[PDB]
RNA sequence: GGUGGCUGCGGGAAUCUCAGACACCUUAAACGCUCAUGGAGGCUAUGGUCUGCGAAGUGAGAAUCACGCGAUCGUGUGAGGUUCAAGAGUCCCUUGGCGCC
DNA sequence: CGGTTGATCTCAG
DNA sequence: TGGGCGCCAAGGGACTCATCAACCG
């Protein structure tokens, strides 16, 4: 019924790691090259290249001797790089006429650390099993964390998070059954820096303690960043410290995402209606006094997870249009009930 | 002999076992390590700390178990307990930290 | 036959 | 002497989430 991405962890060997690195590099190369080519074409001509023209020129590029060493890369990687470039342009053109928010012009990119390429599924090109994954030009890659999949595999996003930590997101149109009737009809949740969530239905208020990971591991993060900054760019030990900092950040985000997953799933399995307010953290983060706390708390991710898991599992999130915490939570529940009825 | 964690594998997290170093003495906090090189600095609240018994840096290396093949150690494959939960991609924008001015 | 590749599609600034 | 310029990460906010006939070893 629903799209769903099963994120597993790859353990590619030397050759497969080299090929994943080469594929990410060539995907970035074609992204930059065709952004430059489209800009040059729109400057020289009345209109720039569209998706089909870019694909045809990419084919001519691969078949040519100028960059024939890009043919040894998975085709869907380059094609979806071009698709991402074209959807960048589509996002830019979404609301140029509108003035509510300016979507920035698509720019270049210069060797970030998180490089992901997508590969599509054509007549059994992706095969998921007990402990392996089937990728087009890689072959069999030893995975772990392989969940239970009972749907058709749409695409596989091969990622890279550290110098030696590769994930892979396998998308499938799985059937997601609606959960049984919830124990309680409706409840409202109030966010907060001191207490992460105060959720109540009028009879109890199981306040959820705020972990505040980012401030909690702020000293080790500061030490990691400082050890990085004393190191020369383009150095092996610079790369080592960079990976250390990246993994510290990955641990922080992992803990935050696990906490948010557990809390959102608990709410959706406990209440039929989960009322909350449409807080805009990107506006509050301009206040440097509370910005670090709002960044760490991640209200936006919490609300996104609550809402989409409600959509999957047959729950309704009645977001409100834009003591203290307890009364705010009760008012949120009342407003959600009013909106629903 | 007791206790706490630092680093590494165990998909994430909490635990938990193992391993590369430790520290404190029944008490809870703090810190990953080995070798080569480099020459006065690194961290922190006017000062304390580690340091010519070597500082920032720079390069390499080890960091679970079984089995297969090499002359204990390299090379390949396989396994990794436990409870909870697991939807991502794209682009753009923003701010968090550090360093220098 | 199993795997890989090139063409499809519907806006602009 | 905090704003500015370099890097390294995160979150926030919309949308989007592919298929098939030919070619090749």
Query: Which bases of chain C are contacted by protein, using any atom under 7 A from a CB?
Result: 2-9, 11-13
Residues A167, A196: one domain?
Answer: no
- Indicate if CB(A124) is under 7 A from strand C: yes
Residues in chain A: 341
- CA of A101, C1' of B12: distance in angstroms: 35
Residue in this structure with the two tokens 């001191």, named with its chain if needed: A194
Structural domain includes residue A117:
yes
Q: How far apart are CA A92 and CA A263, in angstroms?
A: 35
Q: In the PDB record, what is the listed experimental method?
A: cryo-EM
- CA of A197, C1' of B54: distance in angstroms: 51
- CA of A11, C1' of B68: distance in angstroms: 21
Out of A174, A195, A218, a domain closes at A174
Q: How far apart are CA A193 and CA A215, in angstroms?
A: 11
Residues A75, A38: one domain?
Answer: yes
Neighbours of A100 (CB within 10 A): 5
Q: Which two tokens stand for residue A213?
A: 């990971």
Structural domain includes residue A270:
yes
Q: How many domains does chain A have?
A: 3
- Indicate if CB(A132) is under 7 A from strand C: no
Tell me whether strands A117-120 and A184-191 are parallel, antiparallel or unpaired: unpaired
The structure was resolved to a resolution in Å of: 3.1
Structural domain includes residue A107:
no
Which nucleotide C1' is nearest A118 CA? Answer: B89
Residues A70, A141: one domain?
Answer: no
Domain that holds residue A33: 16-94
Which nucleotide C1' is nearest A60 CA? Answer: C6
Which nucleotide C1' is nearest A291 CA? Answer: B95
Residues A88, A126: one domain?
Answer: no
Which of A134, A217, A189 is closest to A333 using CA atoms? A189
Structural domain includes residue A128:
yes
Out of A32, A64, A94, a domain closes at A94
Out of A125, A145, A174, a domain closes at A174
The strands making up A166-174's β-sheet, listed across from edge to edge, are A117-120, A153-158, A166-174, A2-10, A139-144, A132-135
Residues A82, A167: one domain?
Answer: no
Residues A124, A159: one domain?
Answer: yes
Residues A272, A139: one domain?
Answer: no
Residues A65, A153: one domain?
Answer: no
Residues A157, A266: one domain?
Answer: no
- Indicate if CB(A153) is under 7 A from strand C: no
- CA of A226, C1' of B80: distance in angstroms: 36
Active site residues of A: 190, 277, 325
- CA of A71, C1' of B20: distance in angstroms: 44
- Indicate if CB(A98) is under 7 A from strand C: no
Residues A322, A211: one domain?
Answer: yes
Which nucleotide C1' is nearest A254 CA? Answer: B12
Residues A253, A272: one domain?
Answer: yes
- Indicate if CB(A47) is under 7 A from strand C: yes
Residues A124, A220: one domain?
Answer: no
Structural domain includes residue A220:
yes
């Amino acid at each position: 019924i629903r799209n769903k991405a099963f994120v597993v962890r790859l353990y590619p060997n030397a050759a497969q790691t080299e090929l994943i690195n080469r594929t990410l590099g060539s995907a970035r190369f074609v992204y930059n090259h065709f952004l430059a080519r489209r800009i040059a074409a729109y400057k020289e001509s009345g209109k720039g290249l569209t998706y089909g023209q870019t694909s045809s020129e990419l084919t001519l590029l691969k078949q040519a001797e100028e960059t024939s060493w890009l043919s040894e890369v998975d085709k869907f990687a380059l094609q979806n790089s071009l698709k991402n470039l074209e959807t960048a342009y589509k996002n830019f053109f979404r609301t140029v006429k509108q003035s509510g928010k300016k979507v920035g012009f698509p720019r270049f990119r210069k060797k970030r650390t998180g490089e992901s390429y997508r590969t599509q599924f054509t007549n059994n090109n992706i095969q998921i099993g007990e402990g392996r994954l089937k990728l087009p030009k890689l072959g069999w890659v030893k995975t772990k964390g392989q969940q239970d999949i009972q749907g058709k595999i749409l695409n596989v996003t091969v990622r890279r998070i550290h110098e030696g930590h590769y994930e892979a997101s396998v998308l499938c149109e799985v059937e997601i059954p609606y959960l049984p009737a919830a124990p309680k009809f409706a409840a409202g949740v109030d966010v907060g820096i001191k207490d992460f969530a105060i959720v109540t239905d009028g009879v109890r208020f199981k306040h959820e303690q705020n972990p505040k990971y980012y401030r909690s591991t702020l000293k080790r993060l500061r030490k990691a960043q400082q050890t990085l900054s004393r190191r020369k760019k383009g150095s092996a030990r610079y790369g080592k410290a960079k990976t250390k900092l990246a993994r510290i950040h990955k641990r922080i985000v992992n803990k935050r995402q696990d906490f948010l997953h557990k809390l959102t799933t608990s709410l959706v399995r406990e209440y039929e209606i989960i009322g909350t307010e449409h807080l805009k953290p990107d506006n509050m983060r301009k206040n440097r006094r509370l910005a670090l706390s709002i960044s760490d708390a991640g209200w936006g991710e919490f609300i996104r997870q609550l809402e989409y898991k409600a959509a999957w599992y047959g729950r309704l999130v009645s977001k409100v249009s834009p003591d203290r915490d307890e009364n705010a939570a009760l008012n949120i529940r009342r407003e959600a009930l009013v909106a629903a009825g």
